[PDB]
Design an enzyme around this catalytic site. Structure first.
Site: not given
Ligand SMILES: Nc1ccn([C@@H]2O[C@H](COP(=O)(O)O)[C@@H](O)[C@H]2O)c(=O)n1
Ligand SMILES: [Cl-]
Lengths: 115, 112
Positions: B91-93, B29-30, B98-100
């Protein structure tokens, strides 16, 4: 006693009560006893797997099913603004019950970072 | 609609790739929120988990299995947290599912 003797294994066998939302042959969804959001439930496999770190490759469909059931239950519960799904793995994850489970939380704005 | 994760999959912009196969991609993740924080994403453009189909079940599980394996490879022996965000309350960006995976520190409760 199939499914083991964790609290979750016992809930699966109806030996300890729970507030159940959905049940099929592969999984069970029920409300968390200590909710961290206005809606907070768990989706668990009926197959006993201690934690995600020991899941087998052939468990992929089952793990995916937890998410599909989670999103369906969230819709059935009217979480139309969204929700957060969480798996806690081991000590750093804060895991307290060693039977795999997916948290689904909603009904309020969730914040970042996620803990 | 295309997203920045589409560009990453297509190799149009750089990312620190951890793992790739024919159906998913894992990358750091950036904007990391833990000493280790990466994403596992399907190559199929599913915009959000709420619209995932039943046929996507094994793919979604594949994200989790790839995530667990990457976590082990990155030395997360003390554990980690996996997260999928849906919609505004979640809070989906980015509108590409995507799985964090976060670890390398104690994760706290509540999870946001
Ligand atoms: N009887 C019980 C015991 C625990 N629980 C819930 O199970 C969850 C376990 O999650 P962790 O393993 O991630 O801590 C907690 O949220 C806890 O409140 C429950 O819903 N019913
Ligand atoms: Cl997100």
């Amino acid at each position: 006693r199939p499914g083991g003797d964790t609290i979750f294994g016992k809930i699966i066998r109806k030996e300890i009560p729970a507030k159940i939302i959905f049940e099929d042959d592969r999984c069970l969804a029920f409300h968390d006893i200590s909710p961290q959001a206005p809606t907070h439930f768990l989706v668990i496999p009926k197959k006993h797997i201690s934690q995600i770190s020991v899941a087998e490759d052939d468990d992929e469909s089952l793990l995916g099913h937890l998410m599909i059931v989670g999103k369906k239950c969230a819709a059935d519960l009217g979480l139309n603004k969204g929700y957060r799904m969480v798996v806690n793995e081991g000590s750093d994850g804060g895991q307290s019950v060693y039977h795999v489970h997916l948290h689904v939380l909603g009904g309020r704005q969730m914040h970042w970072p996620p803990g």
